[PDB]
Design a protein around this ligand. Structure first.
Ligand SMILES: CC(=O)N[C@@H]1[C@@H](O)[C@H](O)[C@@H](COP(=O)(O)O)O[C@@H]1O
Ligand SMILES: CC(=O)N[C@@H]1[C@@H](O)[C@H](O)[C@@H](COP(=O)(O)O)O[C@@H]1O
Ligand SMILES: CC(=O)N[C@@H]1[C@@H](O)[C@H](O)[C@@H](COP(=O)(O)O)O[C@@H]1O
Ligand SMILES: CC(=O)N[C@@H]1[C@@H](O)[C@H](O)[C@@H](COP(=O)(O)O)O[C@@H]1O
Ligand SMILES: CC(=O)N[C@@H]1[C@@H](O)[C@H](O)[C@@H](COP(=O)(O)O)O[C@@H]1O
Ligand SMILES: CC(=O)N[C@@H]1[C@@H](O)[C@H](O)[C@@H](COP(=O)(O)O)O[C@@H]1O
Lengths: 266, 266, 266, 266, 266, 266
């Protein structure tokens, strides 16, 4: 695993965005061979979407031949609702880049047949072959996507019941009223994420310090699903300063020596 | 993972039996496409076998096209001995249902060539394709089948030396004399069990509280092989009240909210 | 997992050497079907190489049809340097046995294209099919090969930055001057090792007691990569007395009962 | 210790207030023999101060012969600053009850000789003899009073440097401006607290769940000073529901049966 | 502390009995200066009481000037009920030795003022000055006397509510009818025990292995009150083989060399 | 406690030496009221003794009215043996300062009545009243003085059997011949150490990283006696960089800001 120890959220966003751009450009995507990008929502990836849009407007990246897939979506939330993940992605990213509408893949949280919806989402990923880079965040309790505590480490896309802790945390986007936060969500599984060629997790805030510790210095377990990255051949965690407070001095020392040149470029 | 928090062993038995019946009936097994059921012995599954026999006699289930495989068997124990697993299964289940003798698969603990016996048992499972549902219990030390502490998590059917703790616990069936309890047993491996489509573990008693905690809130490790279920895509644990005493309040709270409708049906 | 509890390094060396010989002879290697042996360097395997050479000179083993692959090598260290792993292997083993030079496979730590070197080493292993037995040691921090703390459990051959702790420990071979110890090394990955048919780890000294405990009684995690053996179907650890001091009495008791006949042969 | 498992913060304040009143009335204080009360600031005791005020107004208690000592006080913060603890106490408590000014003992956070201040405070307590009841809260990191992690468990009143986390937590009262929260504070020590006849800690909110777990199920250590209560002969913890989420099921069960009739008062 | 690693419960009783006799004879008690002995009930001290009786019969010890204090007593259980601790002590010990009735101090589990009883017990001990040797056992959950988990480590004699586990454990003596086991009991406190000059705890059976581990290798905490011995200047633990199964190899090794010549007496 | 995070062993000795001198000069000792200093042996305090000697030579301190007490002394080792602690102290300290022979208190490792020796040592300390400052080191297994793991936390001066690990560690001074290192030693106890007014522990080297972690972030327990400092009102730990490698980032951060201006002296 690689851990990029940065200082602020702005730096984190620039590093991640630059990493996404370089992967795409080195890939040289065509209509017959597109780049598949997995994406998350929430407050964590904000600086990354900002930096991505900038680089596109500057002519550094084209999403013309990039296919996207989002991690999850709320069940029973009107698609028009500003806090649905469909609205988040368009407002913060899709509306600003040259990506074709046919290249966008989102889960339908209002699907009449939930099992069928989830299964087809997996079929769609399979038809492309693989997700080259899946970007995500991590929950306070350590969930990756909405794979809450006690989720199988070999799980696929399915419906999941949100933890009370997760709903309280997300209520910040629903006027701070947990009663307005959906109780269920459709989410890619841990196995689905482990199938991606590369996984990049953004970690911001002291609120995520325990989750980072579990991911980096803890054991593999289904209570902190973020620990599944210990089993991935190509995982990267991009962190700000507060989020690294629970790690041992020797651990942080190592990653700082390793990424010194990779980050110190002003 | 799913955890069904019930109160008594009777409820546990009814829930498991009902789950086995619904899986079979939804499967609609034929002679050219049988349902493969993996089964355990011991005191834990007693209420489940009782409920299964009842439902069969009531005309709710037919085992005519069900093929079974047991988890393990004692080495060097005469097949006629009442405490052999061969005798247990016939006395408590086979003698009461319409399952054809050719559909029953048990390990021969008195086989002259142990390696060959174990290998062929794996070949037999493979010829059917897969075990649709494997039901089991858990040991005081956390073993699944007889995969004692320090057993590989990728192990196959083989012979294993029983732990002194396991023999003391099983001596309750041998007049409480550990010297009469066999020292070795043939057992399916952790990998064998992980290959099953669905795994259902029955947990009863405060004596199993530590094992349940290790399985649900602990990390993946070979000392408590029951933790392998964290790596299975479809695992279910059916528990009575005493066995959940070592879990955190928040953990039990979650499963109670999740299975409320799934269990509260009187 | 099997743990062989011996008393001294001499015994450990004899047990491992005898195990390698019996595997080869039972395999009956031909030019069209060679035995693939993975090998380590360092102080740990010294008594094993000594015993192996003896048995060969005594006419008990022929390495004529044995192909070897080493675990790692220092980056930027002249191949002629006495402490390079190339020199170690020839001085301590290759120069004494009847193994053909075309059957020896070592990583080139001075390769101009590191990625290409590592990739080709994996291609070479694949062309043979599999490593039948991979022998290794364990680091003070628990690394297997040079898969230092925080290395993916699904990693392949690649370059790795040595931990300060690892360099201080290895400086004993560089006049006790850490500044002379290389900072990088090419190493087979954890996944590479898990692909071997059988893995045998030699554990010597109280200095390795914590690593043995993590491997045997700890959880699967990427901080102590030696814990990956809990996921291997055929792993063996051969230990001397001091290295077992951190295990529980019951754990050591078990392995002693299990291997009594397998070791007590004077 | 005693753990009072209540559901709401309203019930908590009412239970705690009734307890204080019962101790005072039973003690029957006089001018020559006053009841000595230790008090905290912050949001946690808000419902307790309100209830206490209601009870005094209804004529149930009189503070005419009660002497109070506060836990701490910010250093360098102007006395009449609304967030000073001197201001907090008068505004929320002293302003509404019949307590004489001479019976009020607060630490002078702006004294010339900070060391003389602390020494005199301990002297004041000794002149009265003993604090009969010390009420307090617990911080997210487990600090009791301002005895931050790594504080001696035998400490006395002294100056203390606040942890960054405590300042973020307390920024709520400084317009979420961490820069506005005082960096130092005078505080009674753990030993000062252990000298009290009885200690009652109020625990409210999910953010205190880990601190509650450390205090009840953890070991005594100076990183979570709240753990010092395990050494006190008469400690009580009054909790609301969300704060008990990290405890084991059996732990909460035990306390629920113990205090059943003790909390049915509504 | 001292840990006496013995093999059998027979050796345990003999070692403990010899120790008590040696302390008494060396002390040379008289009417004005008696030796004060603290005693337990239950199955653990059975072999010790027998040996002590044999020694008194052989003329090796006299209890004419020994004063005893028992640890606890069930509340509400009739005095002449065979399972009352008053009955247990006379039947198994007092009936066979020369101890005067006035030298016997037992707690009155059926006293009118339970609080007055406890206070007088502590007073009795103080009138003699100090208990020279307090012998006891340890429960499965680590309780010393009836100071159940979460009991203050500075507690005094008082009334205590038994844990559900302790009642299941003690049901053995109530025809395995948990409903028959008393729910309350008067018990000396941890502080009362720490005031004794010397403490000797008997540990027998595999069921006490975790309690032994907590006492020897764990941290001091109130969940396993037996851990309070780490704070005592003169504590001894006498164990049989199965009770030492959870300790580390080096821990048992250390105690074995220390007490080698100290246990060779057979 | 206070933790002084320094980089080098040279800075450590200088900081510690300056601290001792400041305490002595401020105390202003006289014949009737001497300053009582507790001292250790070994390699850790070497730089401190050198600096102290330089300071005395420069006229900054005088030991004419300082009384010293050493922690321990090997049993059975001849007094004039260069490795005896009596020899170590004179060679490295007493030989170069103006301390009177009568002010020197060392334990007699070769006394006829070893028990009388220990009792008199404690008596000596009491005759002076109290040790004002006790300086010491910490062993790899966390022992303070020679209070090996499982030593009572309330222990007094007595004879102690050395752990095998301590003898391997101390063999450095006996030509790496473990057989030459004394197996027993007279040592002050933990309680003796806790009675001191102030305790300063020097921590140097990566080999003490785990001991430092146990002392600062661990729980109080008798397996790592250095943890007893959490109970001391005035404890200080002076460390070099490598010894802080196992601490959490936030723990070291906290101490770095606290002692910033306190260590800038170079
Ligand atoms: C309606 C709902 O919430 N259903 C989920 C199910 O989709 C999930 O598979 C399982 C846990 O298993 P997993 O997290 O291991 O897949 O829990 C629940 O039954
Ligand atoms: C006779 C006997 O008991 N043999 C078993 C062997 O069958 C098993 O494979 C191994 C542990 O490995 P595993 O539990 O990881 O397979 O231990 C023993 O050698
Ligand atoms: C120059 C160098 O040291 N590169 C390594 C890279 O080869 C390795 O893959 C990664 C950690 O990932 P892994 O240990 O999980 O493969 O760390 C570093 O980037
Ligand atoms: C200015 C300041 O913050 N001084 C405090 C000191 O008063 C306190 O005694 C010590 C920690 O020790 P304690 O918490 O164990 O007393 O830390 C700091 O040196
Ligand atoms: C009727 C009854 O069971 N009362 C006890 C009380 O005597 C004891 O002091 C406290 C726990 O505190 P302790 O174990 O710390 O004394 O629990 C209960 O309130
Ligand atoms: C000869 C010898 O080594 N005797 C010591 C004894 O003096 C010490 O008191 C006890 C451990 O107890 P402590 O460390 O808790 O005092 O161990 C041994 O019996």
């Amino acid at each position: 695993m690689r851990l990029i120890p940065l200082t602020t959220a702005e730096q984190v966003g620039k590093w991640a965005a630059r990493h996404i751009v370089n992967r795409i450009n080195a890939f040289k995507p065509t209509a017959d061979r597109p780049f598949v990008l997995g994406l998350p929502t929430g407050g964590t990836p904000m600086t990354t979407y900002k930096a991505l849009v900038e680089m596109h407007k500057a002519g550094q990246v084209s999403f013309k031949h990039v296919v996207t897939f989002n991690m999850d979506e709320y069940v029973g939330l009107p698609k028009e609702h500003p806090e649905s993940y469909y609205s988040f992605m368009h407002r913060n990213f899709f509306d600003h880049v040259d990506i074709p509408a046919e290249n966008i893949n989102l889960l339908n949280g209002n699907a009449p047949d939930i099992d069928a919806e989830c299964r087809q989402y997996e079929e769609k990923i399979r038809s492309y072959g693989k997700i080259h880079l899946f970007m995500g965040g991590v929950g306070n309790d350590g969930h990756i996507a909405f794979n809450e505590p006690a989720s199988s480490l070999a799980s696929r896309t399915r419906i999941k019941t949100l933890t009370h802790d997760t709903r309280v945390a997300n209520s910040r986007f629903f006027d701070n009223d947990v009663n307005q936060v959906p109780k269920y969500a459709l989410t890619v599984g841990v196995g689905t994420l482990l199938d991606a060629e590369e996984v990049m997790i953004l970690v911001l805030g002291s609120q995520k310090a325990l989750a980072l510790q579990a991911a980096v210095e803890g054991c593999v377990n289904h209570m902190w699903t973020i620990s599944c990255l210990q089993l991935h051949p190509k995982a990267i965690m991009v962190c700000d300063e507060p989020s690294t407070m629970e790690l041992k001095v020797k651990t942080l020392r190592y990653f700082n020596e390793l990424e010194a040149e990779n980050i110190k470029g002003l």
